Design a protein around this ligand. Structure first.
Ligand code: 9ML
Length: 228
């Protein structure tokens, strides 16, 4: 269909192959924050003095499906109900009914300069018979000609996936469904930013995002028919 179909397939397949792997047994991942089933890990990585620290988190959210969690993560129309770090966003291009290109600016965290991002966002169902089906959203930086001029901003590059598998434990009720998330984010912030700032913002904002976002999906879907 669109011009990014092959690249999308490739990003989605790399995440299904690598990002889903369990890291409980992997000492290369540092476990930074645990709050119940919410477990947030990082690797400490710098390229030319820029912090790139890979983020990887798992969570287990009662009462919602993967399909639902991924719709809410992907659907631009509900972005302001859960995002707390975005100043502005514009849909730059609609590629298909499951893929768009988005421009957004993040709120400045003093004393770093503000960051903007230009990324393709795609939502995909990955079919399983002994395995679970998966819903995934991948957001990854692309180049585009309708990129704004924004001289307040350094351009960050991202490769993020929200990957969800759904457990139903034997008319199915929300009480019987559990969504397992794996969330990964590799962000090159560009430019320079104090390493302490980058790291404090990650450490604060990723767990806050995961709590907030997953509670929002629980809240919006409760009392609604289950969308498997
Ligand atoms: C001086 C601070 C530099 C800002 C660097 C930066 C840029 C984008 C992003 C980011 C971009 C996309 C996503 S998402 O999951 O795809 C949802 C859609 O928005 C998530 C996080 C992260 C960071 C890193 C700080 C870290 C941080 C973490 C959670 C919120 C804000 N900042």
């Amino acid at each position: 269909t669109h011009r990014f179909v092959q690249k999308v397939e490739e990003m989605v397949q790399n995440h299904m192959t690598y990002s889903l792997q369990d890291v409980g047994g992997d000492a290369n991942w540092q476990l930074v924050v645990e709050e119940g089933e919410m477990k947030v890990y990082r690797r400490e990585v710098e390229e030319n003095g820029i912090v790139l620290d890979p983020l990887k988190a798992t969570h287990a959210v009662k009462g919602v499906t993967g399909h639902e969690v991924c719709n809410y993560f992907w659907n631009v129309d509900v972005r302001n109900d859960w995002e707390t770090t975005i100043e502005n966003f514009h849909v730059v291009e609609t590629l298909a009914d499951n893929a768009i290109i988005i421009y957004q600016t993040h709120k400045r965290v003093w004393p770093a300069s503000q960051r903007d991002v230009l990324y393709l966002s795609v939502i995909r169902k990955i079919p399983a018979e002994n395995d679970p089906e998966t819903w995934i959203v991948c957001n990854f930086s692309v180049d585009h000609d309708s990129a704004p001029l924004n001289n307040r901003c350094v351009r960050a590059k991202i490769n993020v996936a929200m990957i969800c598998q759904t457990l139903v434990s034997p008319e199915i009720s929300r009480d019987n469904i559990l969504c397992k998330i794996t969330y990964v984010a590799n962000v090159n912030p560009g430019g320079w930013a104090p390493a302490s700032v980058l790291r404090a913002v990650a450490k604060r904002e990723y767990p806050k995002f995961l709590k907030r976002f997953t509670s929002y999906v629980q809240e919006k879907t409760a009392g609604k028919p289950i969308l498997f």
